[PDB]
Amino acid sequence: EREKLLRLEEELHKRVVGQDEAIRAVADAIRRARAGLKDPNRPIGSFLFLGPTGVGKTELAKTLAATLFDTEEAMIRIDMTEYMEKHAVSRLIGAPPGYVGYEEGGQLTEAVRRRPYSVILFDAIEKAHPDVFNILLQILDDGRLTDSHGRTVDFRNTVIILTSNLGSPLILEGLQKGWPYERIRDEVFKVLQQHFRPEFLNRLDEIVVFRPLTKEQIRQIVEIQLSYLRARLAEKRISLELTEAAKDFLAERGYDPVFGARPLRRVIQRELETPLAQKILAGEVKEGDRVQVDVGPAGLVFAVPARV
Ligand SMILES: Nc1ncnc2c1ncn2[C@@H]1O[C@H](COP(=O)(O)OP(=O)(O)O)[C@@H](O)[C@H]1O
């Protein structure tokens, strides 16, 4: 186990590209919980994830779940977009009876109740009703939260990861030489205190900051994401060898500055998977080929080597 903990950044980067500054902070925070220098009555981790969207917030969250608890299923997501009113609370903990399916339970509690070794992701944390924070704050004090039926749900074995892009438009400046390692984590801290109570922020083990990806990185994701496709082709002994520009073509169409790498997968679907099929069906690509994918003025181009 100690081998996993000391090496924690390697095991994480296996799926998460760059963000070393982000990755180090969570791996140091986790090393602190284990080894025993924390309050035991607190979740294994609480982190504020700040940065743009599409740049890996969730990836890390899934990865952290996969590497820390043996699976990406070990991660409960709650979107704070759908919890913005008085009727918010009653979903998270399931606060009837009488009121609809309380006999079902509350989804935060119930999820944590059935799967206590998990990673809980709250997105858009700013959107939540100020009433929701009290609930989340007690979860960080005692590490324990009583549901509506008087079942106390035990969060002490979890990792809580909140996301927001409140600090983003003032992190796109840091990016430009000006501000280096810290100073962004710190100047952004001032904008958070303008939205969040300090009783909440000082429970958070860390506010981690997530820089945008650069065309050399997008490229690296571009590769990882073919994996399934590549695997699936392999069964037919087909290889899929790309070209530098071809990679760049993907990224270009696949990376919205405000929606990060979110689009790319479908992009790959539309620009690469689609035409590929025609050819495979049309017999342009036979079983057992080295496909040479590349760019053109009407999009990607596929060629095969003169057999032999
Ligand atoms: N650092 C990263 N490492 C690997 N893949 C990434 C990274 N950042 C983004 N991606 C890719 O982008 C897609 C969505 O990323 P995601 O974490 O959902 O972004 P966000 O949550 O910020 O919108 C994933 O399918 C993933 O493959």
Curated annotation (Swiss-Prot):
Region (C-terminal): 213-308
Record annotation: effect of changing D123N: Decrease in ATPase activity
Binding site for ATP 2: G51, P52, T53, G54, V55, G56, K57, T58
Subcellular location: Cytoplasm
Taxonomic superkingdom: Bacteria
Residue segments, region NBD2: 1-212
Function noted in UniProt: Part of a stress-induced multi-chaperone system, it is involved in the recovery of the cell from heat-induced damage, in cooperation with DnaK, DnaJ and GrpE. Acts before DnaK, in the processing of protein aggregates. Protein binding stimulates the ATPase activity; ATP hydrolysis unfolds the denatured protein aggregates, which probably helps expose new hydrophobic binding sites on the surface of ClpB-bound aggregates, contributing to the solubilization and refolding of denatured protein aggregates by DnaK.
Subunit details: Homohexamer. The oligomerization is ATP-dependent.
Domain-level remarks: The Clp repeat (R) domain probably functions as a substrate-discriminating domain, recruiting aggregated proteins to the ClpB hexamer and/or stabilizing bound proteins. The NBD2 domain is responsible for oligomerization, whereas the NBD1 domain stabilizes the hexamer probably in an ATP-dependent manner. The movement of the coiled-coil domain is essential for ClpB ability to rescue proteins from an aggregated state, probably by pulling apart large aggregated proteins, which are bound between the coiled-coils motifs of adjacent ClpB subunits in the functional hexamer.
Protein family (similarity comment): Belongs to the ClpA/ClpB family.
Protein's UniProt name: Chaperone protein ClpB
Protein's organism: Thermus thermophilus (strain ATCC 27634 / DSM 579 / HB8)
Lineage: Bacteria, Thermotogati, Deinococcota, Deinococci, Thermales
Residues of the full protein shown: 545 to 852 of 854
